Amino acid sequence: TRCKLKLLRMERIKDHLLLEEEFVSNSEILKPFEKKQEEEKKQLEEIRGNPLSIG
Amino acid sequence: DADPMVSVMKMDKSPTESYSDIGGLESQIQEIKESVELPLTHPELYEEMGIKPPK
Amino acid sequence: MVDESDKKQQTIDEQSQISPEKQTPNKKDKKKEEEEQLSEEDAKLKTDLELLVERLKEDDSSLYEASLNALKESIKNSTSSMTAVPKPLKFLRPTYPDLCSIYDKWTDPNLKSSLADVLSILAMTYSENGKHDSLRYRLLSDVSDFEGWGHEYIRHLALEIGEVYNDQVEKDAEDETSSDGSKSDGSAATSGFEFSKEDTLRLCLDIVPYFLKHNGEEDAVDLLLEIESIDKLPQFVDENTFQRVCQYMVACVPLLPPPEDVAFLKTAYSIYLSQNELTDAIALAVRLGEEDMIRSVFDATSDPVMHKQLAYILAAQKTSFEYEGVQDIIGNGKLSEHFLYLAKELNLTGPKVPEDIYKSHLDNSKSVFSSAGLDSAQQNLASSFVNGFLNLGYCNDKLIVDNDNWVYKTKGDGMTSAVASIGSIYQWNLDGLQQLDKYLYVDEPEVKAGALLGIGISASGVHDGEVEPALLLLQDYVTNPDTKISSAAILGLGIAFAGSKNDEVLGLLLPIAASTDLPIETAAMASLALAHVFVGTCNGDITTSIMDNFLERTAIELKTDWVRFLALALGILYMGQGEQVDDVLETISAIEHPMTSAIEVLVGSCAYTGTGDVLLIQDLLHRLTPKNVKGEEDAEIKSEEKKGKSSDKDATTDGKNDDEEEEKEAGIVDELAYAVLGIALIALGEDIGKEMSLRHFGHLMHYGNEHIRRMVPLAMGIVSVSDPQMKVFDTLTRFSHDADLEVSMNSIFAMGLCGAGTNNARLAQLLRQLASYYSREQDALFITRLAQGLLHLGKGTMTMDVFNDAHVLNKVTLASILTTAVGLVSPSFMLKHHQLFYMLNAGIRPKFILALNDEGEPIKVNVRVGQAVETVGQAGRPKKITGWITQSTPVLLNHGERAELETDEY
Amino acid sequence: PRMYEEASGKEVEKVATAVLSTTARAKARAKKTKKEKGPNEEEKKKEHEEKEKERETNKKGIKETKENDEEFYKNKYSSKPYKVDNMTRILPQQSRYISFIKDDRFVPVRKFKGNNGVVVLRDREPKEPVALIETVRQMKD
Amino acid sequence: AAPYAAKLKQTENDLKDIEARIKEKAGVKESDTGLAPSHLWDIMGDRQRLGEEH
Amino acid sequence: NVKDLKASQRVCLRSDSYMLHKVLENKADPLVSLMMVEKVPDSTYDMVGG
């Protein structure tokens, strides 16, 4: 039981903390502009349009 | 960008064939295994000796 | 199943699957009728048991549950456990499975909560008698194999865990907490836990570390000592006993904060002492960082023996194994005192003997030079350093050196590093002094300084027992009033002794590293040296070094570089303790300036080490805040700022490195990917932060001793051609060195590409040239590890000079420091009484399969290879012994350590 | 009045929430760490006091409060006075009575005869708070 | 199944978080370069598109 | 969606941006068309008999 427990203890704190760190960093990226990260996504779609023609 | 032309080259596999389904001629196994299998396990022997691994 | 009454015994079993006629009806009516019939119930107790036994061979829920339902009620509903004390006490043995039937066989939230409390209580009361132990045993050793008992025995144990854990956190504790309504530890419940523990140690493993941990006291561990020491050979065998101890200890570093972790490991030393291998004892003793635990094993083999026998040779060997020589000083002194012979004992303990075998190993490996010989410009300076870097370890290249031409063509600070690079040819070798002596008495002060660095490097292979020590030569130079000379002198002295403390080393560094009043930037080396002596062992947290940091800041705030080095030295000093490092955190934080805070985060990594997941959230809030503050704005101050930003970045990383070695090997893997993702992240956020994060990455990797060494550096290496600070390359190669030309083939390719391909500045070029040659050694002459060998989860002391140099920008001035990058790992060979210079055979296996280790002890299968091998780095660190089949038996266990072998032929 | 305009709170909020998530996920480690933490605090002080550590934490029993009188058409109201004041908000939007002040020695006209519509009022003493509203018709006439 | 059952639930819980980190990254917003020159290059292509060089 | 689509389903597309509209009823399968153009029958064991 405890063999499972030491892995549970390392894996939870390191990974969940990292997850939290991403969430804050999308927002912070937004600030020098006013929305950089969530706009790069809207731009990619826009630039490419639909359809995309294969060559 | 995957082709079915490459998949012809490739295998999908788990042979029934394993060493020691070879009924004798043990030395010959340990000349083939010295040639094919062994430089993937250790490249260390062949650089330590300074030989180029047999092709 | 069919109801066929009391005809025969087989049809009694079928009867009681639906409704007994000799357990529920009878006993109930009987109890509730007269009170002389409790005596007839006591006879019927024997009956209840036989019937239970027969149907603990079933596994269907329905027919043991429903059957036995009203007995579970009678306790509280009619008797109310008050008609008498012993008579209800001793009849709880049939009612306890009846209880289990709603806990475990069925699961229903309303009843499982309510009867949970009732099971705990009666487990406790009924264990004074010790009839509760026997019910527990009948299921642990079973009657039949069906699924049921495998969960039923599990619940009974889980009761005990529930209550004990809840008494430590809550301030309420005792039996008035409502977790299980049951007493703290009692006084006749205490004895119940000891009796359970034996049976469960015999048959199981699960609850054995666990019980300890819930209490959180070393006392629980000492109780454990007693039982395990009986057991060591008749219940299961010795080998097995060892794999158990360490599983508990390494595993529970995440569950143990400092004042507790040291005290638990005391006990684990004692288990090993009780047992026969005093070699397993020593491994743990190094681990403690205590001088005392080491002295006791040495006294144990030396003192009771009035002969040479095996016993004196075996002592010398054990103490030899640290490559710091923290053990070399302690084991010496008793050899001098007993006196059956000086000559063999003193050489064998010291690094004097490791020199003889090094020559033997060099003979296999040969010497292949592949250095360039570019002359003139900074390109001159690059090529003169590279020769030393290519011949780390004992190598020989005397004649090239003897020609002073290429020496006199070096210039500047460059000239200094050139004389110093010569010393690394003669690394772990006495001779060399002649080359060095020449420069020391002639020309400019520059060649004079570089000789002393080179003496440092050379002298590390022979210094213990004060026989022609580096101390003898280097003192004259320290006294001398010139700064460049003395700084050089005391650096070489730090190297030479390495992690060995003594009266002489300490006492040289005691009236210096305490004058920083008049401005210089080379008295970094002052404290740096004192910090180096301390590592790998117990500390005093010395006042000399803390004082001089303060004074330095008061005197000058121009020389941000001086104070940046000074800061890092404190943190290296404290390395090797963590509990005391808390006391002094406050002292540093006393005087407050935003400037002072830059140091604080650095010293934080050591203080918090071992309660280092409190250390992670801090060093991360510390990072986000810069970006956030900037945010608001978006929508002399110079010196503080620059220092401020770089320190946080070093500290965060520093924190990870020390933590990951000691704690889990598993997280080491995660930490390799995360670091690169961390560099990109900082690159966006803080402009200033980016230069520092590039360079730190190389020492993150080397300190932790990663398993994956091909994929990640190479992907990053390309990216860091574009990025600023070409010093990034040097740091990447320090990790890559490993077994050379496994990892280091791609390293050469990768670094040599970037350097030939674009020359955008010859400054940018110099770093790139050093790195490609640094990384290799011809056909794995010697690997480098920050790890000790003797423990893979301990920490070096020789490598702490490598660590220093990644926080600052590259300079010719930096170059002098990087020549040192000392620490060697001997290959193991079998020794006899005439110190044989070959081995018989060894097994190597990339990583052990086993899970019942977490420290390492190989599987026996392995992969066999012949005689005279270098012990491969990570991706082959486990090295096992083969000799058993030729009727030969090792005395000195190897697991993947540095330790040399000694053998008995029969 | 009520205004829904803000936009500097975002930065202080972003770390503030970062802390709330971080501590929850950290919690698993922190139980074990707290066990040693306690015995010093019990010995010395809670933070810098001996007070309000005699409970579960610093409270036991209902920790919250709420009072409602809005999002109802009648529920509570009781008796509320109002008088006419200068340089004070007064709304005949809220209420249906509105009473005249007796700071003045003059009195308003006759109080309610009841009912609804355009209704003639009648009373036998003018001495009760009522009030007067002025008329645009008198100005024309 | 208590000793192994409780902790197995926790292991699954840990798998959930590893997925969320993934779904956040590729939509708000996957890298192709370092992160920063893939944002600007999108604003650079707007300049080329207005032109009839293609 | 794409959680309804597997490879080798004819689809209707709406010309305008070529937006996917629906799955069409008939599927094409190449191994079916190979024995239809060879035009081998399949027949019972009694027919072989003698």
mmCIF file of N, CA, C and O in Angstrom, chain B residues 38 40-51, chain C residues 710 739-742 745 779-780 844 863 865 870 872:
data_model
loop_
_atom_site.group_PDB
_atom_site.id
_atom_site.type_symbol
_atom_site.label_atom_id
_atom_site.label_comp_id
_atom_site.label_asym_id
_atom_site.label_seq_id
_atom_site.Cartn_x
_atom_site.Cartn_y
_atom_site.Cartn_z
ATOM 1 N N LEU B 38 23.692 -7.948 -30.814
ATOM 2 C CA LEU B 38 24.596 -7.440 -29.810
ATOM 3 C C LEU B 38 24.983 -5.942 -29.975
ATOM 4 O O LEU B 38 25.035 -5.332 -28.895
ATOM 5 N N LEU B 40 23.234 -3.350 -30.555
ATOM 6 C CA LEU B 40 22.215 -2.502 -30.040
ATOM 7 C C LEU B 40 22.171 -2.479 -28.541
ATOM 8 O O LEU B 40 21.928 -1.417 -27.951
ATOM 9 N N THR B 41 22.487 -3.579 -27.889
ATOM 10 C CA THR B 41 22.573 -3.808 -26.479
ATOM 11 C C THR B 41 23.725 -3.037 -25.978
ATOM 12 O O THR B 41 23.506 -2.132 -25.130
ATOM 13 N N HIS B 42 24.901 -3.278 -26.539
ATOM 14 C CA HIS B 42 26.087 -2.505 -26.141
ATOM 15 C C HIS B 42 26.778 -2.016 -27.373
ATOM 16 O O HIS B 42 27.146 -2.901 -28.104
ATOM 17 N N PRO B 43 26.927 -0.745 -27.696
ATOM 18 C CA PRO B 43 27.865 -0.183 -28.656
ATOM 19 C C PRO B 43 29.218 -0.089 -27.912
ATOM 20 O O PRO B 43 30.197 0.244 -28.585
ATOM 21 N N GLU B 44 29.242 -0.287 -26.567
ATOM 22 C CA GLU B 44 30.328 0.012 -25.645
ATOM 23 C C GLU B 44 31.454 -0.904 -25.927
ATOM 24 O O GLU B 44 32.583 -0.441 -25.905
ATOM 25 N N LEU B 45 31.207 -2.155 -26.313
ATOM 26 C CA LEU B 45 32.265 -3.123 -26.501
ATOM 27 C C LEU B 45 33.094 -2.789 -27.712
ATOM 28 O O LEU B 45 34.274 -3.089 -27.794
ATOM 29 N N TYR B 46 32.353 -2.328 -28.801
ATOM 30 C CA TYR B 46 32.899 -2.113 -30.099
ATOM 31 C C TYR B 46 33.689 -0.859 -30.149
ATOM 32 O O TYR B 46 34.703 -0.873 -30.922
ATOM 33 N N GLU B 47 33.398 0.213 -29.327
ATOM 34 C CA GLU B 47 34.211 1.428 -29.280
ATOM 35 C C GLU B 47 35.373 1.155 -28.308
ATOM 36 O O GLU B 47 36.413 1.795 -28.493
ATOM 37 N N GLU B 48 35.209 0.339 -27.285
ATOM 38 C CA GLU B 48 36.234 0.096 -26.336
ATOM 39 C C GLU B 48 37.396 -0.639 -27.046
ATOM 40 O O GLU B 48 38.567 -0.290 -26.919
ATOM 41 N N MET B 49 37.033 -1.664 -27.842
ATOM 42 C CA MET B 49 37.969 -2.383 -28.768
ATOM 43 C C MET B 49 38.460 -1.452 -29.914
ATOM 44 O O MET B 49 39.538 -1.549 -30.349
ATOM 45 N N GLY B 50 37.490 -0.518 -30.368
ATOM 46 C CA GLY B 50 37.859 0.359 -31.465
ATOM 47 C C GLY B 50 37.545 -0.239 -32.793
ATOM 48 O O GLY B 50 38.015 0.295 -33.853
ATOM 49 N N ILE B 51 36.688 -1.320 -32.878
ATOM 50 C CA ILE B 51 36.295 -1.892 -34.143
ATOM 51 C C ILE B 51 34.971 -1.238 -34.532
ATOM 52 O O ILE B 51 34.261 -0.654 -33.702
ATOM 53 N N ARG C 710 20.318 11.327 -24.086
ATOM 54 C CA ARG C 710 20.448 11.502 -25.532
ATOM 55 C C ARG C 710 19.512 12.572 -26.041
ATOM 56 O O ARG C 710 19.952 13.363 -26.849
ATOM 57 N N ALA C 739 29.309 7.990 -19.342
ATOM 58 C CA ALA C 739 30.171 7.074 -20.124
ATOM 59 C C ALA C 739 30.435 7.768 -21.435
ATOM 60 O O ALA C 739 29.456 8.165 -22.114
ATOM 61 N N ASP C 740 31.713 7.949 -21.827
ATOM 62 C CA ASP C 740 32.108 8.747 -22.935
ATOM 63 C C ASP C 740 32.185 7.983 -24.162
ATOM 64 O O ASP C 740 32.802 6.933 -24.283
ATOM 65 N N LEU C 741 31.491 8.571 -25.148
ATOM 66 C CA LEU C 741 31.255 8.175 -26.480
ATOM 67 C C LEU C 741 30.106 7.277 -26.523
ATOM 68 O O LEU C 741 29.843 6.620 -27.533
ATOM 69 N N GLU C 742 29.223 7.292 -25.442
ATOM 70 C CA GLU C 742 27.908 6.731 -25.656
ATOM 71 C C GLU C 742 26.958 7.876 -25.923
ATOM 72 O O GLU C 742 26.434 8.010 -27.028
ATOM 73 N N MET C 745 29.123 11.061 -28.061
ATOM 74 C CA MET C 745 29.293 11.099 -29.481
ATOM 75 C C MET C 745 28.420 12.135 -30.158
ATOM 76 O O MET C 745 28.961 12.863 -30.980
ATOM 77 N N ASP C 779 37.424 6.930 -25.177
ATOM 78 C CA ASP C 779 36.893 5.584 -24.968
ATOM 79 C C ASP C 779 36.553 5.317 -23.505
ATOM 80 O O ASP C 779 36.767 4.222 -22.940
ATOM 81 N N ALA C 780 35.988 6.397 -22.858
ATOM 82 C CA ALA C 780 35.527 6.324 -21.503
ATOM 83 C C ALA C 780 36.665 6.002 -20.535
ATOM 84 O O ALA C 780 36.719 4.900 -19.865
ATOM 85 N N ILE C 844 26.740 -6.508 -15.854
ATOM 86 C CA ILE C 844 26.163 -5.207 -15.802
ATOM 87 C C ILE C 844 24.753 -5.273 -16.307
ATOM 88 O O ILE C 844 24.528 -6.148 -17.171
ATOM 89 N N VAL C 863 23.878 -9.213 -17.482
ATOM 90 C CA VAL C 863 24.359 -9.428 -18.797
ATOM 91 C C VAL C 863 25.839 -9.666 -18.470
ATOM 92 O O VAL C 863 26.344 -8.800 -17.764
ATOM 93 N N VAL C 865 29.900 -9.810 -19.040
ATOM 94 C CA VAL C 865 30.979 -9.321 -19.838
ATOM 95 C C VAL C 865 32.277 -9.756 -19.108
ATOM 96 O O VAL C 865 32.245 -10.085 -17.904
ATOM 97 N N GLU C 870 35.559 -0.366 -17.453
ATOM 98 C CA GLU C 870 35.059 0.836 -16.753
ATOM 99 C C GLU C 870 33.591 0.709 -16.409
ATOM 100 O O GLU C 870 32.768 0.227 -17.205
ATOM 101 N N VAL C 872 30.209 1.852 -16.125
ATOM 102 C CA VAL C 872 29.416 2.673 -17.040
ATOM 103 C C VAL C 872 28.555 3.583 -16.145
ATOM 104 O O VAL C 872 28.279 3.219 -14.994
#
